[PDB]
Design an enzyme around this catalytic site. Structure first.
Site, short mmCIF file in Angstrom:
data_model
loop_
_atom_site.label_atom_id
_atom_site.label_comp_id
_atom_site.label_asym_id
_atom_site.label_seq_id
_atom_site.Cartn_x
_atom_site.Cartn_y
_atom_site.Cartn_z
N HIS F 201 0.86 -1.47 0.21
CA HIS F 201 0.48 0.07 0.15
C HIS F 201 0.10 1.19 -0.08
N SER F 205 -0.02 -0.36 -6.63
CA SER F 205 0.07 -1.59 -7.34
C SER F 205 0.32 -1.26 -8.33
N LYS F 227 -15.59 -6.28 -9.42
CA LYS F 227 -15.16 -6.48 -10.37
C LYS F 227 -14.68 -8.17 -10.34
N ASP F 228 -14.29 -7.74 -8.49
CA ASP F 228 -13.70 -9.47 -7.57
C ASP F 228 -14.86 -9.65 -7.40
N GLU F 271 1.56 -34.97 -4.20
CA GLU F 271 0.14 -34.41 -4.99
C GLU F 271 0.35 -33.06 -5.83
C1 LIG Z 1 -7.70 -6.40 -5.69
O1 LIG Z 1 -7.95 -5.66 -4.48
C2 LIG Z 1 -7.89 -5.63 -3.35
C3 LIG Z 1 -6.87 -5.24 -2.01
O2 LIG Z 1 -6.09 -3.96 -3.09
C4 LIG Z 1 -6.73 -2.74 -3.49
C5 LIG Z 1 -6.95 -5.92 -0.60
O3 LIG Z 1 -5.74 -5.33 -0.39
C6 LIG Z 1 -7.82 -7.10 -0.31
C7 LIG Z 1 -7.62 -7.10 0.93
C8 LIG Z 1 -6.82 -9.03 0.74
C9 LIG Z 1 -8.12 -10.09 0.94
C10 LIG Z 1 -8.94 -10.49 1.73
C11 LIG Z 1 -7.48 -11.12 1.19
C12 LIG Z 1 -6.54 -11.76 1.98
C13 LIG Z 1 -6.36 -11.05 3.12
C14 LIG Z 1 -6.47 -9.32 4.21
C15 LIG Z 1 -6.42 -8.53 5.60
C16 LIG Z 1 -7.72 -11.09 5.27
C17 LIG Z 1 -6.80 -11.68 6.28
C18 LIG Z 1 -7.97 -13.06 6.54
C19 LIG Z 1 -7.74 -13.25 8.25
C20 LIG Z 1 -7.49 -13.48 9.43
C21 LIG Z 1 -8.95 -14.39 7.61
C22 LIG Z 1 -9.92 -14.30 8.87
C23 LIG Z 1 -11.47 -15.47 8.63
C24 LIG Z 1 -11.57 -16.13 8.82
C25 LIG Z 1 -12.67 -17.84 7.93
C26 LIG Z 1 -13.16 -16.74 9.54
C27 LIG Z 1 -12.52 -17.59 10.76
C28 LIG Z 1 -12.82 -16.77 11.69
C29 LIG Z 1 -13.83 -16.55 13.01
C30 LIG Z 1 -14.72 -15.57 13.96
C31 LIG Z 1 -14.84 -16.98 12.14
C32 LIG Z 1 -16.36 -17.31 12.44
C33 LIG Z 1 -16.48 -18.68 12.85
C34 LIG Z 1 -17.85 -19.04 13.56
C35 LIG Z 1 -18.93 -19.20 14.06
C36 LIG Z 1 -18.17 -20.12 14.21
C37 LIG Z 1 -19.53 -21.30 13.38
C38 LIG Z 1 -19.86 -21.97 14.58
C39 LIG Z 1 -21.83 -20.78 15.02
C40 LIG Z 1 -23.04 -20.89 14.95
C41 LIG Z 1 -21.56 -22.19 16.27
C42 LIG Z 1 -20.95 -21.20 17.47
C43 LIG Z 1 -21.26 -21.31 18.56
C44 LIG Z 1 -20.51 -20.70 20.33
C45 LIG Z 1 -18.71 -20.19 20.34
C46 LIG Z 1 -20.62 -21.45 21.28
C47 LIG Z 1 -19.69 -20.86 22.16
C48 LIG Z 1 -20.65 -21.24 23.72
C49 LIG Z 1 -20.42 -21.25 24.68
C50 LIG Z 1 -19.22 -20.65 26.29
C51 LIG Z 1 -21.14 -21.49 25.71
C52 LIG Z 1 -21.54 -20.18 26.74
C53 LIG Z 1 -23.52 -20.80 27.57
C54 LIG Z 1 -23.64 -20.19 28.53
C55 LIG Z 1 -24.86 -21.25 29.70
C56 LIG Z 1 -23.37 -19.20 29.42
C57 LIG Z 1 -8.99 -7.27 -2.02
C58 LIG Z 1 -10.32 -8.25 -1.20
C59 LIG Z 1 -8.95 -6.93 -3.07
O4 LIG Z 1 -10.25 -7.46 -3.80
C1 HEM Z 2 -0.68 -16.33 -0.47
C2 HEM Z 2 -1.25 -15.51 0.15
C3 HEM Z 2 -1.17 -14.40 -0.79
C4 HEM Z 2 -1.83 -13.48 -0.92
C5 HEM Z 2 -3.33 -13.53 0.33
C6 HEM Z 2 -1.57 -12.03 -1.99
C7 HEM Z 2 -2.75 -10.62 -1.55
C8 HEM Z 2 -2.30 -10.09 -2.89
C9 HEM Z 2 -2.97 -9.16 -3.27
C10 HEM Z 2 -4.26 -8.86 -2.63
C11 HEM Z 2 -2.25 -8.34 -3.65
C12 HEM Z 2 -3.06 -6.85 -5.13
C13 HEM Z 2 -3.62 -6.95 -5.73
C14 HEM Z 2 -3.75 -8.21 -6.49
O1 HEM Z 2 -2.29 -8.08 -6.60
O2 HEM Z 2 -4.29 -9.36 -7.31
C15 HEM Z 2 -0.98 -8.27 -4.02
C16 HEM Z 2 -0.12 -8.32 -4.45
C17 HEM Z 2 1.06 -8.73 -5.47
N1 HEM Z 2 1.72 -10.05 -4.54
FE1 HEM Z 2 0.56 -11.10 -3.10
N2 HEM Z 2 -0.56 -12.61 -2.23
C18 HEM Z 2 -0.33 -13.87 -1.59
C19 HEM Z 2 1.32 -14.09 -1.99
C20 HEM Z 2 1.94 -13.66 -2.67
C21 HEM Z 2 3.12 -14.18 -3.34
C22 HEM Z 2 3.53 -16.09 -2.63
C23 HEM Z 2 4.11 -13.56 -4.18
C24 HEM Z 2 5.44 -13.79 -4.49
C25 HEM Z 2 6.66 -13.40 -5.53
C26 HEM Z 2 3.16 -12.07 -4.45
C27 HEM Z 2 3.73 -11.38 -4.94
C28 HEM Z 2 3.05 -9.87 -4.80
C29 HEM Z 2 3.46 -8.94 -5.50
C30 HEM Z 2 4.98 -8.78 -6.09
C31 HEM Z 2 2.51 -8.49 -5.55
C32 HEM Z 2 2.31 -6.63 -6.68
C33 HEM Z 2 0.88 -6.83 -7.56
C34 HEM Z 2 1.62 -5.24 -8.17
O3 HEM Z 2 2.60 -4.71 -7.50
O4 HEM Z 2 0.99 -5.12 -9.32
N3 HEM Z 2 2.38 -12.76 -3.21
N4 HEM Z 2 -1.43 -9.70 -2.86
#
Ligand SMILES: COC1=C(OC)C(=O)C(C/C=C(\C)CC/C=C(/C)CC/C=C(\C)CC/C=C(\C)CC/C=C(/C)CC/C=C(\C)CC/C=C(/C)CC/C=C(\C)CC/C=C(\C)CCC=C(C)C)=C(C)C1=O
Ligand code: HEM
Ligand SMILES: CCCCCCCCCCCCCCCCCC(=O)OC[C@H](COP(=O)([O-])OCC(O)COP(=O)([O-])OC[C@@H](COC(=O)CCCCCCCCCCCCCCCCC)OC(=O)CCCCCCCCCCCCCCCCC)OC(=O)CCCCCCCCCCCCCCCCC
Ligand SMILES: COC1=C(OC)C(=O)C(C/C=C(/C)CC/C=C(\C)CC/C=C(\C)CC/C=C(\C)CC/C=C(/C)CC/C=C(\C)CC/C=C(\C)CC/C=C(/C)CC/C=C(\C)CCC=C(C)C)=C(C)C1=O
Ligand SMILES: COC1=C(OC)C(=O)C(C/C=C(\C)CC/C=C(/C)CC/C=C(\C)CC/C=C(\C)CC/C=C(\C)CC/C=C(\C)CC/C=C(\C)CC/C=C(\C)CC/C=C(\C)CCC=C(C)C)=C(C)C1=O
Ligand SMILES: CCCCCCCC/C=C\CCCCCCCC(=O)OC[C@H](COP(=O)(O)OCCN)OC(=O)CCCCCCC/C=C\CCCCCCCC
Ligand SMILES: CCCCCCCCCCCCCCCCCC(=O)OC[C@H](COP(=O)(O)OCCN)OC(=O)CCCCCCCCCCCCCCCCC
Ligand code: HEC
Ligand code: HEM
Ligand code: HEM
Ligand code: HEM
Lengths: 241, 51, 62, 379, 55, 379
Positions: F201, F205, F227-228, F271
C-alpha cells in the site's frame, strides 16, 4: 449423615517445603501392594518401569516382571496366547470389567489407586486414618451384614473389611511388620504413584528461589538507576515578575 | 559491486575487522553453550560435569 | 592507591560492547556449572538417606 | 542519515506503540497489569500449543491422554501445571485490571471500555471450555449444569441445548467442538486486544490524579520498559511459586476421577473465578430470574459510565466514594466465599443479602453520594 | 560507570541461564516420550537358537 | 458534519485499505487473483474448522473418523470435498499470482516480493501436513519419504528427523503433532498476508504497461468491488463443478485404503501441486545434492530482481522475453508430467534435461536476451 470426622495432620517426612520422599519406604510400600492390594484394587497408569530409578534396579525389576503372566497379541495363523511380561506392561488388572468386580465385592467398585491421593481430600493423611480406626459402631446405629463401620468414611459404612493387621507379610529388609508401619509405607508409595515428579519439582523450586533472590534486587536496582533522574528532578517557576 | 572498490573502503573494513572477530566468537561460544556440544566442551579446563 | 577492581573491569571489558557480550556469555557458561552443582549438593544434603542414589549401596552388583 | 525507525512501515507502528509513545510519568503499578495480561496470554498460547501435540479430544481417551502426558512426556507435568496455574493468574490480573478503571474513572474512554467488556466475555468462554477438556467429574458435570441453563429461554430452549450438545446429552461430539473452540478463541482475543490498544492510542493513558497529563509526558522505551519488565519478573515469581510448591491449591479434587454420568458429587462447585456469578444465580429461586441476574451483572459495567455523576474522574479526592468502593469489593469477596460453601440456611440468606447489596450499591448509592460530594464542594 | 554496568552485566547472566533451561524443557518434550523408548530398542535375545532354525 | 469513515479509527483503516485507495484503471483480470487467494484462505479455514469438530488425530481412529464424517455426519461429504478441492484451487491461484509478477515485473517491489516468498513456503507446509491427516496409504508413505530426506544433512540430519518424528518411525505422535501445526499455521499466514498488503500500500499497485499510472488512478470501491465479485462468482463456479460432478479426479486413489506400514505401494507420488519439485530432486544422483537443488530452485525466485537487467519493467514490449517465458512455462508442465511417471530411462533423461533447462533459462538466457533487446533499441 453427620459431618465427617476430619483426619489430623500427621508428620510425614515430606511435609516440609523442601523435603523429599524416603525411597526405602516406597520400596516396602510397593512390596505391600504386590499381594495385599492387588487382589481387587488396580493401578491402571503404572508400568513395571518407573521403578528402575526410584526403588529397584534394572535386573531386579526384570526378574519381578517375569513372575507375572500377561496375554499377548494374536499369534500369526493362530490365536491369543500368554506371555511372561516385560518392562513395558502395566500392572495386571484384577477383573476384566467393572461389573465383574462389583459382583465379587457385594456391588461395591474398588476405585483405581493411581490418583486416589490427589482425588480425596486430606491426601495420604485421609488414607492413613482410614486404614486404621476400624472401630465398632456406637450405640444406636446398625449396619448391613456386609458393611463395616469406619468413622472417617463419609457415610461411616464401608464394604472394605480391615485389610491390614500384624504379621500379614514379612519385609526382606527385616523391619518388623506393624499395622502402623505397613500403613505408613503404603501411603508413601501411593503418594509417589500420584506424584512421581515430587523430588524433581522441589529441586527446581529450590533453584528458582535462589535465582529470584539474586535477580529481584538486581532488577530493582536497575529500575532505580534509570528512574533516579526523574525522582531527583527539581522544578522552578519564574514568571516575568 | 564495482563501485565499492577503493582505498577508503579498505580502511573501513580494516577498522571493523576486530569487531567482527569478537561478534563471531560470541556467536560460536553461544552456539556451543546453548547446544552443549560435547566434543568441544570435552576440551575445556574444568567444565566436565558430563561422564 | 591501586586502581579499583571495577575500573579495570570496565576499561578492558565493559567499554567495548562486543567484549561486554563475550564476558557475559563466558560468565553464563561458568556460573551455570557452579550454580547447578551447588544447588544439587544442598538439596542432597537436606535429604541424606531419602534419595535412592544414597540407597544403591545396600543392594548393587547382585 | 535520519533514523531508520521513522521510514520503514513496520517500524513506524512499533515506534508509535512502543518506543516514542507519550505516557504520563506518575502512573503507578496499577497501569502494569495491562501489559501482564498480554504476556500471560502469550504464555498460555505457547503452553497450550505444546499440550495439544499429545491430547486426544475424545470422551474415551482424553483422561488417559493427560495421565500419559504427566508420566511419559518429558516435562509434561510442568507444562500442564503451568497452563492450569497460568489461567488463574490471568483472571487475577484481569480483575485488578478492571478494578483500576472503576476506581480511577478510566471508563470515560467509551470505546476502550466497551472493547474490554467484549474481551472479558471472550476470555470467560475460553476458560470454561478449557476446564471441561480434562474430562473429570467436575468437568463433565460443570458443563452439564451450565449448558442446561439455556433451557430457560421462553420458546426455543431445548433446541439450543441439543444443538450445542450435538445430541441428547453431553458426550464426545460436545468435547470435540469445545476443543476446537478452545483452540481458536484465544487467537480471536488477540485481534480484539489490538483493537483495544487501537482506540486507546487516540487519547492516551489516564493518570491517577485524573487531570490532564500533557505537561508531564515522557517516552516509554527507557522508563516503562524496565518498569514493566520488573512487573513481569514478579508475575513469573508468583506463577512459578504456585506451580513448583503448591501445584494443586487453586483447583479442586474429583477432577482426578473419571467422569461418571451416573454418579454425581454433592457440592459440585464451579471454578473459583466463576463463583460470584454462581451465587447470584442461586440467590433467585426462578431460573429465568437467575440468568437475567447473571447477564444484568456484566451489563452493569456497560452502564457504569452512564451512572457517573461526579465532576471528577479519580476517587482519590472523594473519600466517601472510596469507602463505598471498598465495601463493594468486600461484598464480592463474600459472594466468592459463599459460592464455595454448601447450600444451607445461613449461607443462602447471606448470599441474598450480598446480591441485593451488590446491585443497590452500584445502581443507587454511588450516584447519590457523588451528588452529595458535589454539594459539599459548592460546585 | 564500571559499577553500574557490572549490575547490568550480572543481571543478563541470570536471564540467560533460565532462558536456556526453559527452552531445553519445551524442546525436550517433543523428543520422545518415555514409553516410546521403552517399547523400542528393547530386543535382547538369547543365543540358544539351534542351527537352521528361525525363531 | 464530515463522513464518519474518515474519523473513526477502525473506519480509517477500512477506508484506506478497501474503499478509497487509488488503483490503476487498466489492471486486467490477472490482478484479480490476489483477492481470490484470500477468499480461498477464508473458505479453507471455515470448512476445515467444521471438519475439526469431528476429526480424531490418532493412528487408529483417524481413518475411521473420516469415514464417519463422509457418511453419518450431515453434509460431511460436501464439506470434506470443498476443503480438499479448495486446496487445489488455492495453489492454482497462487501459481497464477506468482506468474503475473514475473511477466509484468511486479518483483521490482522488493519488500512486497520477498514477503510473498515466505507466504508461499508457509502455504506449502500447511498443505503438506494436511495431506497426512487422512492417514491413508499414500499419506503415510508420502510423509515417510519427504521426511527421511533430511538424513542427508551433514551431521545433524539423523538427529533432526527422529526429533520431528517423536520416535524411531512415523506413528500417532507425528499425526497429532502435524494436526496442531496444520491448525495453527494458516492463521500465521493470515497475519503475514496483512504485511503483504501493508508494504504494497505504501507504493501502489502496478499496471500491465509498466508505466506509472498516477495520471489515471481510480477509487477502488465501485469498479473493482464488482469486478472482484465477478471473479469470485467464477471461482465458485469452478470449485462447485469440481466437487459436485467429479470430486475425485484431482486426487489420487489408493488413499482410500488404511495405511499399512509393512506395504510399500509400487508408485509413490506427491500431490499434483508438488510434483514439479519431486522430479527436480529425483533426477540429481546425490541425495544431498537433490535437496540442495530443490532449495536453490525455490530461492531463485528471490534472486529474480537481481538478474533483471532490462530497461523496461513489463515484458509486454519484449517479444523475445515472452517466448522464453512461455518456454519456461512449458518446461514446468514437462516437470509436472514426469513427476507422475515411474522411474525409467526415457523419463529420467527427460527430467534431467528439463531440470538443467529450467535453471539455465532463469540464470543465463533471460539476462542475455534482455541485454540484446536493450542493444536493439539503442538505449
Ligand atoms: C484487488 O483489490 C483488492 C486489494 O487491494 C486493493 C486488497 O487489499 C484486498 C484485501 C485482501 C484480502 C481478503 C486477501 C486476504 C487478506 C486480509 C487482511 C484478511 C486475512 C484473513 C484473516 C485473519 C482470516 C479471517 C477469518 C476467517 C475464516 C474466519 C475464522 C474466524 C472466526 C470468528 C470466524 C467465525 C466462525 C464461527 C461463528 C463458528 C461457526 C459456529 C457457529 C454458530 C456456532 C458457534 C458457537 C459458539 C462460540 C458457542 C459458544 C458457547 C459458549 C461459552 C457456551 C455459553 C453457555 C452459557 C450457558 C453462557 C481485496 C479483497 C481486493 O480485492
Ligand atoms: C499466499 C497468499 C497471498 C495473498 C492473499 C496475496 C495478496 C495480494 C493482493 C490482494 C495483492 C494486490 C491485488 C493483486 O495483486 O491481485 C497482491 C499483490 C502482489 N503480490 Fe501477493 N498475495 C499472496 C502471495 C504472494 C506470493 C506467493 C507472491 C510471490 C511473488 C506475491 C507477490 C505479490 C506482488 C509482487 C504483488 C504486487 C502486485 C503489483 O504491484 O501489481 N504474493 N498480493
Ligand atoms: C483487526 C486487528 C486490527 C489491528 C490494527 C493494527 C494496525 C494499526 C494501524 O495501522 O494504525 C492504527 C494506529 C494509529 O494509526 P497509524 O499508525 O497512523 O496508521 C493508520 C493508517 O491508516 C495505516 O495506513 P494503511 O491503511 O495504508 O495500512 C494498512 C494496514 C494497516 O496496518 C496493518 O494492518 C498491518 C499489521 C500487521 C500485523 C501482522 C504483523 C506480524 C506478521 O493494513 C493493511 O495492509 C490492509 C489489511 C486488510 C484488512 C483490513 C481490515 C480492517 C478492519 O496505530 C496503532 O498504534 C495501533 C496499534 C495496534 C496493534 C498494537 C500491537 C501491540 C503488540
Ligand atoms: C516431492 O516432495 C516434496 C514436496 O511434495 C510432497 C514438497 O511440497 C516440498 C516443500 C516443503 C514443504 C512442506 C516442506 C518445507 C517447509 C519449509 C522450508 C519451511 C519450514 C517452516 C515451517 C512450518 C514454519 C514456517 C515459518 C513461519 C511463520 C515463520 C515466519 C513468521 C513471521 C511473522 C514472518 C515475519 C518476517 C518478518 C519481519 C521479516 C520482514 C521482511 C521481509 C520479507 C523482507 C525481505 C528481507 C531480506 C534480506 C530479503 C531481501 C534481499 C535483497 C536485495 C537481496 C536479494 C536476495 C538474494 C537471495 C539474491 C519438498 C521440499 C519436497 O521434497
Ligand atoms: C503498560 O504499558 C503498555 C502498553 O500501553 C501503554 C501497550 O500497549 C503494550 C503493547 C504490547 C502488549 C500487551 C504486548 C502483547 C500484545 C498483544 C495483542 C498480545 C498478542 C499475543 C500474540 C500473537 C501471541 C504470541 C504467541 C503465539 C502464536 C505463539 C508463538 C509460538 C508459536 C507458533 C510456535 C513457535 C515454535 C515453537 C515452540 C517450536 C516448536 C516447533 C518446531 C520446530 C516445528 C516442528 C516442525 C514442523 C511444522 C514441520 C515443518 C516442516 C515440515 C513437514 C517438512 C520440512 C521438509 C522436509 C524435507 C522434512 C505494552 C507491552 C505495555 O507495557
Ligand atoms: C507450476 C506449473 C504451472 C503449469 C501451468 C502452465 C499454464 C497454463 C496457462 C498459462 C496461461 C494461459 C493464459 C494466457 C494465454 C496467453 O498467452 O494470453 C496472451 C497474453 C499476452 O498478452 P500481453 O503481452 O500481456 O498484452 C496484453 C494486451 N495486448 O498472455 C499474458 O498476458 C500472460 C501474463 C501472465 C499470466 C500468467 C501466465 C501463466 C503462468 C504460469 C506459470 C508462470 C510461472 C510460475 C513460476 C512459479 C511456479 C511455482
Ligand atoms: C488494592 C490493594 C490492596 C489495598 C491496599 C490499600 C490501597 O490500595 O489504597 C487505595 C489506594 C489509595 O491511594 P490513591 O488512589 O493513589 O489516593 C490516595 C493516596 N494517594 O487506591 C487504590 O489502590 C485503588 C486500587 C483500585 C484497583 C485495585 C483494587 C480494586 C480491586 C477490585 C476487585
Ligand atoms: C491393601 C490395603 C488397601 C488400600 C490401601 C486400599 N484398599 Fe480398598 N476398597 C475395596 C472396595 C470394594 C472399596 C469401595 C468401598 C469400600 O471401601 O468398601 C475400596 C475402597 C478403597 C479406598 C477409598 C474409597 C473411597 O471412595 O474413598 C481406598 C483408599 C482403598 N480402597 C485403598 C476393596 C478392597 C480389597 C478387596 C478385599 C482389598 C484387599 C482392599 N480394598 C485393600 C486396600
Ligand atoms: C482480556 C485481555 C485484555 C488485554 C490483553 C488488555 C490490554 C490492555 C493494555 C495493555 C492496556 C494498557 C494499560 C495501561 O495503559 O494502563 C489496557 C488499557 C485499558 N484496558 Fe484493557 N486489556 C484486557 C482486558 C480489559 C477489560 C476486561 C477491560 C474492562 C473494562 C479493559 C479496559 C481497559 C481500559 C479502560 C484501559 C485504559 C486505561 C487507561 O486509559 O488508564 N481491558 N488494556
Ligand atoms: C487465554 C487463553 C487460554 C486460557 C484462559 C486457557 C485456559 C485453560 C484451562 C483453565 C484449562 C484446564 C486446566 C486444567 O484443567 O487444569 C485448559 C486446558 C487446555 N487448553 Fe487452554 N487456555 C487458553 C489457551 C489455549 C490455547 C491457545 C491452546 C492451544 C492448543 C490451549 C489448549 C489447551 C489444552 C490442550 C488443554 C488440555 C489441558 C490438559 O490436558 O490438562 N489452550 N485451558
Ligand atoms: C490455506 C489453508 C488450508 C489448506 C491449504 C489446507 C489443506 C488441506 C488438505 C490438502 C487436506 C487434505 C484433505 C484430503 O486429502 O482429503 C486437509 C485436511 C484437513 N484439514 Fe485443511 N487446510 C487448510 C486449513 C485448515 C484449517 C484452518 C483447519 C482447521 C481449523 C483444517 C483442518 C483440516 C482437517 C480436519 C483435515 C482432515 C480432512 C480429511 O482428512 O479429509 N485445515 N487440509
Amino acid at each position: 449423615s453427620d459431618l465427617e470426622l476430619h483426619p489430623p495432620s500427621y508428620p510425614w517426612s515430606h511435609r516440609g517445603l523442601l523435603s523429599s520422599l524416603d525411597h526405602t519406604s516406597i520400596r516396602r510400600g510397593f512390596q505391600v501392594y504386590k499381594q495385599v492390594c492387588a487382589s481387587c484394587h488396580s493401578m491402571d497408569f503404572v508400568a513395571y518401569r518407573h521403578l528402575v530409578g526410584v526403588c529397584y534396579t534394572e535386573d531386579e525389576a526384570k526378574e519381578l516382571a517375569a513372575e507375572v503372566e500377561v496375554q499377548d497379541g494374536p499369534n500369526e495363523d493362530g490365536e491369543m496366547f500368554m506371555r511372561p511380561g516385560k518392562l513395558f506392561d502395566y500392572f495386571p488388572k484384577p477383573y476384566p470389567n467393572s461389573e465383574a468386580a462389583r459382583a465379587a465385592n457385594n456391588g461395591a467398585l474398588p476405585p483405581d489407586l493411581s490418583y486416589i491421593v490427589r482425588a480425596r481430600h486430606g491426601g495420604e493423611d485421609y488414607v492413613f486414618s482410614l486404614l486404621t480406626g476400624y472401630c465398632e459402631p456406637p450405640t444406636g446405629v446398625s449396619l448391613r451384614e456386609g458393611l463395616y463401620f469406619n468413622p472417617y468414611f463419609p457415610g461411616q459404612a464401608i464394604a472394605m473389611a480391615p485389610p491390614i493387621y500384624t504379621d500379614v507379610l514379612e519385609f526382606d529388609d527385616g523391619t518388623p511388620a506393624t499395622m502402623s508401619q505397613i500403613a505408613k509405607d503404603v501411603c508413601t508409595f501411593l503418594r509417589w504413584a500420584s506424584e512421581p515428579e515430587h523430588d524433581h519439582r522441589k529441586r527446581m523450586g529450590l533453584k528458582m528461589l535462589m535465582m529470584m533472590a539474586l535477580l529481584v534486587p538486581l532488577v530493582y536496582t536497575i529500575k532505580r538507576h534509570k528512574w533516579s533522574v526523574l525522582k531527583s528532578r527539581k522544578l522552578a517557576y519564574r514568571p516575568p515578575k | 559491486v564495482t563501485r565499492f572498490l577503493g582505498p577508503r573502503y579498505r580502511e573501513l573494513v580494516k577498522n571493523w575487522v576486530p569487531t567482527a572477530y569478537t561478534w563471531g566468537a560470541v556467536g560460536a561460544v553461544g552456539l556451543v553453550w546453548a547446544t552443549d556440544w560435547r566434543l568441544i566442551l570435552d576440551w575445556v579446563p574444568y567444565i566436565n560435569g558430563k561422564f | 592507591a591501586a586502581a579499583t577492581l571495577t575500573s579495570k573491569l570496565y576499561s578492558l571489558l565493559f567499554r567495548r560492547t562486543s567484549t561486554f557480550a563475550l564476558t557475559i556469555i563466558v560468565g553464563v557458561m561458568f556460573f551455570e556449572r557452579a550454580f547447578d552443582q551447588g544447588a544439587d549438593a544442598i538439596y542432597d544434603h537436606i535429604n541424606e538417606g531419602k534419595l535412592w542414589k544414597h540407597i544403591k549401596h545396600k543392594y548393587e552388583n547382585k | 542519515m535520519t533514523p531508520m525507525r521513522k521510514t520503514n512501515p513496520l517500524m513506524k507502528l512499533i515506534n508509535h506503540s512502543f518506543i516514542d509513545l507519550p505516557t504520563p510519568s506518575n502512573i503507578s503499578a496499577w497501569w502494569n497489569f495491562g501489559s501482564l495480561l498480554g504476556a500471560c496470554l502469550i504464555l498460555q498460547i505457547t503452553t497450550g500449543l505444546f499440550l495439544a501435540m499429545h491430547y486426544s479430544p475424545d470422551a474415551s481417551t482424553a483422561f488417559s491422554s493427560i495421565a500419559h502426558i504427566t508420566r511419559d512426556v518429558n516435562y509434561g507435568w510442568i507444562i500442564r501445571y503451568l497452563h492450569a496455574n497460568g489461567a488463574s493468574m490471568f483472571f487475577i490480573c484481569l480483575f485488578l485490571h478492571i478494578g483500576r478503571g472503576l476506581y480511577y474513572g478510566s471508563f470515560l474512554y467509551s470505546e476502550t471500555w466497551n472493547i474490554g467488556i467484549i474481551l472479558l466475555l471472550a476470555t470467560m468462554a475460553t476458560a470454561f471450555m478449557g476446564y471441561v477438556l480434562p474430562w473429570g467429574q467436575m468437568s463433565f458435570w460443570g458443563a452439564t449444569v451450565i449448558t442446561n441453563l439455556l433451557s430457560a429461554i421462553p420458546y426455543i430452549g431445548t433446541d439450543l441445548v441439543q444443538w450445542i450438545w450435538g445430541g441428547y446429552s453431553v458426550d464426545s461430539p460436545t468435547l470435540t467442538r469445545f476443543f476446537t473452540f478452545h483452540f481458536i478463541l484465544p487467537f480471536i482475543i488477540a485481534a480484539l486486544a489490538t483493537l483495544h490498544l487501537l482506540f486507546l492510542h487516540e487519547t492516551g493513558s489516564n493518570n491517577p490524579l485524573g487531570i490532564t497529563s500533557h505537561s508531564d509526558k515522557i517516552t516509554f522505551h527507557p522508563y516503562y520498559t524496565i518498569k514493566d519488565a520488573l512487573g513481569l519478573l514478579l508475575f513469573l515469581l508468583s506463577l512459578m511459586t504456585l506451580t513448583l510448591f503448591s501445584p494443586d491449591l487453586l483447583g479442586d479434587p474429583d477432577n482426578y476421577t473419571l467422569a461418571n454420568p451416573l454418579n454425581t458429587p454433592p457440592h459440585i462447585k464451579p471454578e473459583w473465578y466463576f463463583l460470584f456469578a454462581y451465587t447470584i444465580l442461586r440467590s433467585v429461586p426462578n431460573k429465568l430470574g437467575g440468568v437475567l441476574a447473571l447477564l444484568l451483572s456484566i451489563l452493569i459495567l456497560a452502564m457504569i459510565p452512564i451512572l457517573h455523576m461526579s465532576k471528577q474522574q479519580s476517587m482519590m479526592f472523594r473519600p466517601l466514594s472510596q469507602s463505598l468502593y471498598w465495601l463493594l469489593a468486600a461484598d464480592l469477596l463474600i459472594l466468592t466465599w459463599i459460592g464455595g460453601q454448601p447450600v444451607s440456611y445461613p449461607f443462602t440468606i447471606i448470599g441474598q443479602v450480598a446480591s441485593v447489596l451488590y446491585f443497590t450499591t452500584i445502581l443507587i448509592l454511588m450516584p447519590t453520594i457523588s451528588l452529595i460530594e458535589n454539594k459539599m464542594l459548592k460546585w | 560507570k564500571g559499577f553500574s554496568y557490572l549490575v547490568t552485566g550480572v543481571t543478563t547472566v541470570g536471564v540467560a541461564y533460565a532462558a536456556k533451561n526453559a527452552v531445553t524443557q519445551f524442546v525436550s518434550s517433543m523428543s520422545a516420550s518415555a514409553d516410546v523408548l521403552a517399547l523400542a530398542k528393547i530386543e535382547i535375545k538369547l543365543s540358544d537358537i539351534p542351527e537352521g532354525k528361525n525363531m
